[PDB]
């Protein structure tokens, strides 16, 4: 039910130039997409807001697309209270030595939980700074400056075929000046 | 408390003549159960008996405050489960099994995890869809509540949890009828 | 149009709080048939099933507007007859035989006798009755309409004529059910 | 020879939203077609204005279009001095349980005449008041709030192979916005 | 520890009209009586503040008595956190097809729990909220308006041959116009 | 269904003095009962307010009353439109030669109708009209100035065992100052 | 409008021959009823019951109690007494002509309004007891009338 | 806050049967105690003890005292009548019929708060003697029941 923010330095990325003053309209669409599984066994990737198969499928219809807002959820699964684990989520820029394992000699990578009978489990909101990167993502000269999320994890001792948690992860985009396209 | 965008119906107009005074009538019914087995519920309030028996005798009926209450059972004390949830338009190719690859997506779940035993209170902000229910004509942008649970590792006899729904609604332009 | 005099029904009174708006809603029902034989109708309004599916759901109910009417059939043009009626409290020992032993009395003919062949209207000056209907309590101020004809000389297998009743009510304070 | 208005409730229905401020003019037409016969047995129907074979007849050419006045008439025949009978007349939208048999435990269904050595028999009108219903005919997205005539009666005991009374109702319309059709 | 306001509907009962501007003193006196067990068995009634035993031996020396406040508490008992179970609470007039069974079909019900070594278990105000309902309790005119406890339950799993929780529901009434009794 | 006077001539009859200005208030009670019937048999009767058996029922309690307005109504009867007959109504005090049979020869005496397939036959109200006869009824010292009905008539040609029509006649009194009676 | 005061009595009831012991409400009381019928409202005024030795009685004497009471009260015919307002007297040799008994109603005790457009429930009731023991002669003991105004208005449609 | 009245009556005890003779204190008196427990403070306004011969007594009459007297007074229940304020009357063939007896307490004699935070000794005590000789029959000969309003106040946790 809760937000935590992640620590993040000023640097923001250099953008394409512009028109007159926002040459074509545009419009905000929202989404939210399943980032990845837990539990059923060591479990440790990389996604790049750039190469969402989710993503593109709506960015796909346009040249100039840009970020808004972008948040980084952690919804916990039924089971869990009885067979907890570790996430290791971070926000950077695709462009980085950063690898799942290291999650943690970063900078704003945090260590969580999530089951248990202690503690009380419920959804974790980790809100991506986009100050600390480049907010453009399709755009017609490609960055480097991608938002990309790493979070980690260890493998289960008692993996379940089930997962444990979601990294659900959701926000806002401005698609803008069209594309072409098949149909 | 579930996300939303601004997402407005746009509904007909009243011509300047004058129009019948309403009632406000309030509502809550049972909608689902969980804890027997694999429960996709969609439900579309447009639609539902309970609260048909409370248009059909008017023409205007408009909604006005509407809470999707979620509520567990001695049972989850013991053996929990997980349930996903979102406010929608009845348009929306969503498939409770997607509950949340849709913006706005709801999920929590309750029981044996600390203070998993209490009532849960998410509504829809009525600017996501169309505030009418039964006019001149038939929308779409009526609102469709839907959830889901996978099928539970120990199935019951009895549910774990209701979701009952409740609120209440203009009625006006009186049916003229058969006393 | 019967004659009366101010007899006016004391009722209870709300409390400053606010009450929930009410809607107004219009009946008519078949209230009795002639010409099958001596037909000594009494009925209250208070407990005709016709209002009352209209009153059960909510627990302040006032009449606005009510006529008594009085229709003929394309029998009365060959086999008249006569009928008695009046607007009365359902209090009067008032027996329908005596329909017009009683201040107001009303009485004519219709069916062969140049312009029998007509509709009928009569009222009840709602002054003379208690305008409420279903309260907190139970009023006796309650209206009851009475009538009768004799037994036709000649008896038929269908009716002569109706004597539908019409009316409007404020209906408000809902009540709080079951869905 | 006369008018009697049916009483009735203010629910006018709501219509289709509108362009500029009448976007396109319109005309005024008349018509008065048939609606029912009577005397030549049981006769119980009910006529919606909306699928008035006659009135598309005219509507049919157009794509907006609503009426203004609308009549319900009652004119009695030659007979029926002799063999006397009763219709129930009724404005009602076409959208309600209403049936022939209690055109009666309605609301404004009233009880009639016409015939027998004593009534003088004389043309009868009842104006359907529009406000109780949606006025709007044809329309871009149809409505369900359509004036549809109720009217019923009883088997005779005579029939003739004649009628012994025609239910003849007039108004008018305002057929706008054209069609297309055919020739 | 705490209170939580059960959802009520504008609908104050027609009381009796008045004196002068009372014509009598009253008093303000409290009470606080038990409602009902749980846990013994199936337990689901339904109380009338009008025919409350106790209630009437304080109401029974006056002719003219209505309520001020009323509430509604749920204490928990010692058991419990080993056998959990559920109440269905709901405030409505004693004029009502509302049942214990359907306790939530109603408006206001609400479920809970109780126990369970999650839960931390503490009693539970639930305020009536007479706007809801006729204050007034005996009077010269007996009304039907009256506040009436709903709240049920299902059979336990593991019957207790004591108590489980516990209705008591307190307030405070205004008894006047006195009344006359044997001594 | 109306209205018609009687020719009256300027006669009040003289009453009892008066105490301060209305030394007791008192109430005004309305009453409404049966004339005579006709076609039985050749009716010619004559009532007076003053012994009328029923309006006693009513002054009975009292010492002081008079009365406001006294109507004579004739509500003809189902038959008649096939053994039509004829009334004479006449308004005249008590204290006169006047017999039904010359209720013509007199002043006001009117002749009527009722039945037959020619007339309407509808009810006919003829007001006494008071200002030509005593008004007050029981009073301290009685008085012979007292409203008496006439109206007479012929036996019928055929005569039927159940009425033809009725002489109701209603009004309002106004009874006042107190009696004792029995209890 | 307005209404006029009316005076009644009636026998209310013999506590004389047998055990007698009985109630009786001013509403149901077929006497006053059958005087407030004509009007479609009445409030009671002044109100007392009275009581009457028979000739006899100085033969076998008896007592009798009184007491006024709403229409509720749980009030005993026989706990009568035990209630506030509650009288008692004998009979024969002991005070028969001083004006006889006479025990009044107050009105600040109940209510009056002897039949409205409501039932009200606070209308008066009488609570007699003896128990006629020694010899139960076929001949009233005692009277026990009860005699009052009452204002009545609102015109009400009747018989005549 | 403000108190309410409220009245009462009790059968106080009967000088019949047997030589009776005793003493009542009002603080004690089980019926009113019943009816002010639920108060934390009462004082008494207006008091009466009532007198009532029983149909009997014409036969066997008898004769009572009466006296009102504070807690303490050494008022012996014989010594009565000596004390000011009291009286004496016989039964039977002598006004039994004429209002009943009755009599009175003053309030400016003793004191009232029935029952306050403390436990004043001028409460109100009666007093009355017979001597029941002649022939005890197993049914009372006298009533000396005692009424009176009373107000009381400032709520007080109780039972229910």
Same mark, same amino acid.
């Given at each position: 039910?809760?937000?935590?923010?992640? /620590?993040?330095? &000023? +640097?923001?990325?250099?953008?394409?130039?512009?028109?007159?003053?926002? $040459? %074509?309209?545009?419009?905000?669409?929202?989404?939210?997409?399943?980032?990845?599984?837990?539990?059923?066994?060591?479990?440790?990737?990389?996604?790049?807001?750039?190469?969402?198969?989710?993503?593109?499928?709506?960015?796909?219809?346009?040249?100039?697309?840009?970020?808004?807002?972008?948040?980084?959820?952690?919804?916990?699964?039924?089971?869990?209270?009885?067979?907890?684990?570790?996430?290791?989520?971070?926000?950077?820029? /695709?462009?980085? &030595? +950063?690898?799942?394992?290291?999650?943690?000699?970063?900078?704003?990578? $945090? %260590?969580?939980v999530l089951g248990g009978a202690?503690?009380?489990?419920?959804?974790?909101?980790?809100?991506?700074?986009?100050?600390?990167v480049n907010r453009m993502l399709?755009?017609?000269?490609?960055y480097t400056d991608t938002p990309?999320?790493?979070?980690?994890?260890?493998?289960?001792?008692?993996?379940?075929?089930?997962?444990?948690?979601?990294?659900?992860?959701?926000?806002?985009?401005?698609?803008?000046?069209?594309?072409?396209?098949?149909?």
């Amino acid at each position: 039910v809760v937000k935590v923010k992640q /620590a993040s330095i &000023p +640097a923001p990325g250099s953008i394409l130039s512009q028109p007159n003053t926002e $040459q %074509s309209p545009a419009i905000v669409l929202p989404f939210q997409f399943e980032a990845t599984t837990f539990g059923t066994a060591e479990t440790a990737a990389q996604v790049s807001l750039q190469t969402a198969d989710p993503i593109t499928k709506l960015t796909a219809p346009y040249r100039h697309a840009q970020i808004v807002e972008c948040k980084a959820i952690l919804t916990p699964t039924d089971l869990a209270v009885s067979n907890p684990l570790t996430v290791y989520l971070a926000w950077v820029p /695709a462009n980085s &030595p +950063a690898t799942p394992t290291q999650i943690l000699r970063v900078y704003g990578g $945090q %260590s969580f939980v999530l089951g248990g009978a202690i503690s009380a489990a419920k959804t974790i909101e980790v809100p991506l700074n986009l100050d600390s990167v480049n907010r453009m993502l399709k755009d017609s000269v490609t960055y480097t400056d991608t938002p990309k999320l790493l979070a980690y994890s260890r493998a289960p001792t008692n993996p379940s075929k089930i997962p444990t948690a979601s990294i659900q992860i959701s926000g806002r985009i401005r698609l803008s000046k069209p594309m072409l396209i098949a149909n």
